[PDB]
Amino acid sequence: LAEYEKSQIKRALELGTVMTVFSFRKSTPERRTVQVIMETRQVAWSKTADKIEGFLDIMEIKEIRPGKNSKDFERAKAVRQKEDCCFTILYGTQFVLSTLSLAADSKEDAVNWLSGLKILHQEAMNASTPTIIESWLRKQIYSVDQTRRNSISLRELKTILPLINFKVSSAKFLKDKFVEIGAHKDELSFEQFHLFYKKLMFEQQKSILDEFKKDSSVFILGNTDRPDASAVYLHDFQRFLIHEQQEHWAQDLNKVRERMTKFIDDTMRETAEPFLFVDEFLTYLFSRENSIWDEKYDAVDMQDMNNPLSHYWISSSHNTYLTGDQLRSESSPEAYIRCLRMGCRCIELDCWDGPDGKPVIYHGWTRTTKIKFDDVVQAIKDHAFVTSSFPVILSIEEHCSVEQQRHMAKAFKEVFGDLLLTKPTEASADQLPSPSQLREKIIIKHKKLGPRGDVDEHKQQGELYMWDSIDQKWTRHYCAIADAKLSFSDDIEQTMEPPTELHFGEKWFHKKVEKRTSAEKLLQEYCMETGGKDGTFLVRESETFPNDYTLSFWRSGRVQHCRIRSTMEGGTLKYYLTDNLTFSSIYALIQHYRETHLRCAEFELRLTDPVPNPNPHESKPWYYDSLSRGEAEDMLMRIPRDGAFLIRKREGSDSYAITFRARGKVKHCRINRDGRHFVLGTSAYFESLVELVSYYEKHSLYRKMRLRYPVTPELLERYNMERDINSLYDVPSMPQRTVKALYDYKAKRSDELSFCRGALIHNVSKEPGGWWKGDYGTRIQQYFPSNYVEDISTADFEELEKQIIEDNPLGSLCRGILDLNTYNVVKAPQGKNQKSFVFILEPKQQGDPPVEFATDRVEELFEWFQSIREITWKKNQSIAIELSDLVVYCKPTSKTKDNLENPDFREIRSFVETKADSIIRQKPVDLLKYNQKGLTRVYPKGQRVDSSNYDPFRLWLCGSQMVALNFQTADKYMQMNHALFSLNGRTGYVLQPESMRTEKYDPMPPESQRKILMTLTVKVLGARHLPKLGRSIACPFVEVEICGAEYDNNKFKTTVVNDNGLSPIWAPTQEKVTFEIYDPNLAFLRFVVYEEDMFSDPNFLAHATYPIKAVKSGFRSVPLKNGYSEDIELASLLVFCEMRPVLESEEELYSSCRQLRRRQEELNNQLFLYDTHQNLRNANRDALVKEFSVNENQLQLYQEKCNKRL
């Protein structure tokens, strides 16, 4: 359409239409006003203008599907609707996209909507960062106040600041900023809010400009930048690009002008030479077009797509239909759509027997929602080539019968048709044809009819109800029987969820009004809570008026009280305040008071202050005012199960330490009642302790464990009887806290410790502030920063636990193992505890409580009972030729699975992770030679029931191109996979370099052969928009690391910034960090931002996986993605990247830098000679001190030497 036509479409969008919306949660579709607020960039659905039901970020839109093709559109009401007037918006950062399904009334409305959203999404990637900052500010403002207010208040600001993850330094600070902006009745406008933002971000991180304020490349001439008013010019910016960012296109001034006028995006800047300010320069420093990502790898390169397929890493996925853990995930073809849109070229299809004659796709012999094959194949055809249009190989795991195989083949030949690859592209094939030769071709890998011939197992697993005695319910656990060992996992159900007196004990009013002065002190102490003191009412029990309530209310500058009068009318109570304002129902009292305007000539203002009990904990079970540490410990010995928590008051203290069971440990954490807010940690501000419990029963207090069971006294009793679950738990000492050295830290002061990478430091005491007293050779008990090292404890118990994870039926996630050999089953046909279907496992010894397991069906009860009863007592299938012929390439061959010699390009190697890793350990070069012609499926083993992925990198070096990784997970390795397959324009077909395709290359070269080709020097300087995980404000720290090979993998975290994530600043005094990667192509740069809680445990905030080949030099912004590799709004780091070539002279010097490690590993070996050993001879150890500083200098010198050099 034309630009004015597009404008009319988008204004129709902004106007909004009352349109039908479908949901699987709410069966009835509802008519809601759907409209786009362009300034917030939100598609919002509302019931009225002020009440908006839901938001949808336009940049969050990933896919628009016309018609009824969504799980919301399977409803019967959708059948009455028409497809031309139906569509869905797919949005969200999660793997399964949230689906906003809109059914239309007229086809014109629908087509206008699709066109408008496509235009808005197109301009979404075209929006400059200042515009998205405007949008995000407007989002905060329209989120805190639903009426879409364009003004902001003092308090309100006191609440946005924690929400946008910034800690209010002081009320005086925000007041001062209000003043310099200009505050009228301490209220600001949206533009003044934006100015407030500019001030905060510039002032908080104005020391970034110091790097440009330096005196080597004064070309940029950054100076006088102290104030944001300071500004630069187009010439300054192009000198910055040509020198710091090292941009060759920057030679032309006109391109620089175009980029600058794009970034500023302000019509008022009509200057022939565009100019921006120092604060605006800093905003650019965290902007999208300053991304460290290389854009020339965002475009598909045809010369890199014309080569035999064996030389192409191809993005593959394991059990792709699954959306969560393999045990109970909900299979959906939308997962296939998602993976194809990311750019997968291989999706696993576990085709099992179908009751209808059509195979169902799910994880067989497990409890997962089955899906129809035809819907799957339709979805694959629809969205396989909508992105990147390169061939996808369907991973078919055949587990059906021959009739279903005929249906399989005919479905492929019908739905896919020409899309399916049926005949070889060229008959006399010597090798794999290029992906360019395979334009939009469906390749089927599937067990061919090798035996030919003319014409021609599960373990007992499932959910069970374990009879809990703590709560006297039936808690459902997933159980798997492996070698007569039934293992049960955690709760599956856990993820699923009068006219009097009641008002007296309601949130509105609770207790303690024995005198009207008590209410006056209750609400006067509550008067200085907010800015407007008019918002102050309370109901109370009268002291003088008998059997009457009394509204103690504020009145425009003072606190008053008046009795809520009560009468007996019609045999019922009747409370009245005004002559005709009255009711009888208290639950309805709250609502009609909320709608009430406290109207009377006397009373014109309404306030609606739901102020509750100043201390409900006062009357709280988990609250224990007189309970001390010792009492808690003892009583937690009585209840040693994780999730048992009590809030015991410290005697004579406002802090109420929480005694709770964390990993079988009695952990305490004080909650200080600062002012009125109960603060956990440093900034976890809570209204009250009951709110604390309610928030942390669904939020993680400490690692995985959550506040699960409050430990009541009575409880002590119910568990007076114990051993309900037996606490299988995990079924040397820690004075040293043995640590590894992240990087070469130099002794800043004589009490600081000098050492080298990988150094084993012992007798380490964790003094706060990051400085740890540790022993290192002759340097006994010396400081070293916590960021320059890493902790690796001797969790031998945890290792045994991981061995259990290995041989465990459930593998990981198992919450308990019970050996069925040493038990007996008794089946209860009448059942036990209100459950007819019960089988009780009574152990050999009656001393072990018999445990009751319940099912939902009598037949499954019989099956479980039969299996465990048996434990106690102790070519022909003719795979379809019609499907086999469809397998042009990659036909499985189990006969020569171990054979890697004489490879055939038409063959495929299916390997599990452990088998492939073993092959790599034995012979990397042989498998590389095979995959030079052949191909490899490396896929996770059956123990990865939790969708956790393995390390896929060693496989890629050996040429193992096809690595099925579970796309539903959020682990490190899938961020690695997304980083790898984002290369070459996110096509999923990555050409390996020339070295890979030659046999002379060693996939794992010897340490002597390893030579530097890239010694990166990275420097983190600042950040913007670090996301918040929990109530407590994130205390972020960045860890930059090369997760390349076992020689490239190197980590470095930085000093933690406390209570600042909106505009966190790292010290410029930190040293430049050197990553010596011997191979540039096979390496990845990863900035993982974490946050530190009160337990100082890092928690994943975000990641920054980028290929080294894509890494550009300069002061580059680094966009931050979530665990699903999706860019979150405005979250970005800044890094002073420096690309570095290994010159011949540098190489000699880098041979010296290898001499560094060649003898510092022996320096570490002499630290280990006296690691904790003491009965030693001081001959070499003390004489490697020579060695010691010789190496210290040797390197630091020649490194800062090349430093000084470039």
Q: Which of 912, 976, 985 is nearest to 1121 (CA)?
A: 976
Let me know whether 335 and 376 are in one domain.
yes
Tell me how far the alpha carbon of residue 514 is from its chain's centroid.
51
- 1195 part of a folded domain: no
- 725 part of a folded domain: no
Let me know whether 275 and 177 are in one domain.
yes
Of 673, 690, 718, the last residue of a domain is 718
- 538 part of a folded domain: yes
- Separation of alpha carbons 334 and 341, rounded Å: 10
For the packed helices 373-383 and 402-411, what is the interaxial angle rounded to 10 degrees?
Answer: 30
Q: Which DSSP string corresponds to 1108-1147?
A: GGGPPPEEEEEEEE-TTS-EEEEEEEEEEE------HHHH
Spatial CB neighbours of 1118, under 8 Å, sequence gap ≥ 6: 291, 292, 1087, 1104, 1106, 1132, 1133, 1134, 1135
Please check whether residue 1130 is in contact with residue 1118, taking contact to mean a CB–CB distance below 8 angstroms: no
Give catalytic status of residue 318 as yes or no: yes
Let me know whether 432 and 309 are in one domain.
yes
Amino acid identity of residue 91, one-letter, is Y
Q: What CATH number corresponds to the domain at position 901?
A: 3.20.20.190
- Separation of alpha carbons 1192 and 1204, rounded Å: 18
Q: What CATH number corresponds to the domain at position 120?
A: 2.30.29.30
Let me know whether 7 and 86 are in one domain.
yes
Cβ of 723: how many Cβ atoms within 10 Å? 11
- Separation of alpha carbons 1199 and 1193, rounded Å: 10
Amino acid identity of residue 973, one-letter, is Y
Amino acid identity of residue 498, one-letter, is P
- Separation of alpha carbons 288 and 298, rounded Å: 14
Count of structural domains within the chain: 7
Q: What are the phi and psi torsion angles at 754 (to 5°)?
A: -100, 140
The DSSP bridge partners found for residue 573 are: 568
Q: What are the phi and psi torsion angles at 1143 (to 5°)?
A: -70, 165
The DSSP bridge partners found for residue 752 are: 783
Q: Which of 121, 311, 318, 762 is catalytic?
A: 318
- Separation of alpha carbons 736 and 942, rounded Å: 37
Q: Are strands 671-674 and 677-680 parallel, antiparallel or unpaired?
A: antiparallel
**Tokens representing residue 1065 in the block:** 């600043």
- Separation of alpha carbons 1075 and 1072, rounded Å: 10
Q: Which of 184, 235, 243, 363 is catalytic?
A: 363
Please check whether residue 208 is in contact with residue 278, taking contact to mean a CB–CB distance below 8 angstroms: no
- 170 part of a folded domain: yes
Please check whether residue 415 is in contact with residue 381, taking contact to mean a CB–CB distance below 8 angstroms: yes
Of 694, 718, 742, the last residue of a domain is 718
Distances (CA, A) of 1178 to 254, 565, 754, 777, 1184: 69, 93, 20, 11, 10
Spatial CB neighbours of 827, under 8 Å, sequence gap ≥ 6: 838, 839, 861, 865
Q: How many residues does the chain have?
A: 1206
Let me know whether 96 and 169 are in one domain.
no
- 1163 part of a folded domain: no
Let me know whether 306 and 438 are in one domain.
yes
**Tokens representing residue 585 in the block:** 């129902």
- Separation of alpha carbons 498 and 491, rounded Å: 35
Cβ of 3: how many Cβ atoms within 10 Å? 7
Please check whether residue 864 is in contact with residue 460, taking contact to mean a CB–CB distance below 8 angstroms: yes
The DSSP bridge partners found for residue 775 are: 762
Of 1108, 1140, 1172, the last residue of a domain is 1140
Amino acid identity of residue 598, one-letter, is L
Let me know whether 13 and 120 are in one domain.
yes
Please check whether residue 476 is in contact with residue 491, taking contact to mean a CB–CB distance below 8 angstroms: yes
Distances (CA, A) of 892 to 39, 886, 930, 1090, 1193: 55, 13, 14, 43, 56
- Dihedral of alpha carbons 806, 811, 815, 817, sign: negative
Please check whether residue 742 is in contact with residue 1039, taking contact to mean a CB–CB distance below 8 angstroms: no
For the packed helices 333-342 and 972-986, what is the interaxial angle rounded to 10 degrees?
Answer: 60
Q: 1154 in helix, strand or coil?
A: helix
Q: What CATH number corresponds to the domain at position 691?
A: 3.30.505.10
Let me know whether 598 and 631 are in one domain.
no
Q: Which of 1135, 1142, 1154, 1167 is nearest to 1194 (CA)?
A: 1154
Let me know whether 36 and 120 are in one domain.
yes
Q: Which of 161, 150, 144, 153 is nearest to 183 (CA)?
A: 153
Spatial CB neighbours of 1175, under 8 Å, sequence gap ≥ 6: none
Let me know whether 203 and 274 are in one domain.
yes
Please check whether residue 453 is in contact with residue 876, taking contact to mean a CB–CB distance below 8 angstroms: no
Domain interval for residue 557: 498-613
Spatial CB neighbours of 1083, under 8 Å, sequence gap ≥ 6: 1014, 1042, 1044, 1045, 1048, 1077, 1107, 1108
Let me know whether 178 and 275 are in one domain.
yes
Please check whether residue 789 is in contact with residue 761, taking contact to mean a CB–CB distance below 8 angstroms: yes
For the packed helices 129-144 and 154-163, what is the interaxial angle rounded to 10 degrees?
Answer: 120
Let me know whether 106 and 241 are in one domain.
no
Please check whether residue 435 is in contact with residue 390, taking contact to mean a CB–CB distance below 8 angstroms: yes
- Final resolution, Å: 4.2
Conformation bin of residue 834: beta by default, left when phi > 0, alpha when psi is -120 to 50: left
Q: 760 in helix, strand or coil?
A: coil
Q: Which DSSP string corresponds to 782-794?
A: EB--STTEEE---
- 433 part of a folded domain: yes
- Separation of alpha carbons 1071 and 195, rounded Å: 34
Helix, strand counts (H, E) of the chain: 29, 58
- 131 part of a folded domain: no
Spatial CB neighbours of 142, under 8 Å, sequence gap ≥ 6: 37, 40, 42, 148, 149
Please check whether residue 1160 is in contact with residue 1044, taking contact to mean a CB–CB distance below 8 angstroms: no
Q: Are strands 1014-1018 and 989-991 parallel, antiparallel or unpaired?
A: unpaired
SS (H, E, C) 80-105: HCCHHHEEEEEECCCCCCEEEEEECC
Please check whether residue 332 is in contact with residue 957, taking contact to mean a CB–CB distance below 8 angstroms: no
Burial class (CB in 10 A: 0-12, 13-18, 19+), 550: buried
**Tokens representing residue 1173 in the block:** 């050993």
Amino acid identity of residue 799, one-letter, is E
Q: Which of 954, 968, 1131 is nearest to 1043 (CA)?
A: 954
Give catalytic status of residue 668 as yes or no: no
Sheet containing 42-46: which strands, arranged edge to edge?
52-54, 42-46, 30-37, 17-22, 98-103, 86-91, 61-66
DSSP state of 1026: P
- 481 part of a folded domain: yes
- Separation of alpha carbons 466 and 484, rounded Å: 18
Q: Which of 1081, 1087, 1043 is nearest to 953 (CA)?
A: 1043
After which residues, if any, is the chain broken (C to N > 2.5 Å)?
456, 497, 731, 874
- Separation of alpha carbons 264 and 795, rounded Å: 54
Amino acid identity of residue 432, one-letter, is L
Question: Structure solved using which method?
Answer: cryo-EM
The DSSP bridge partners found for residue 476 are: 465
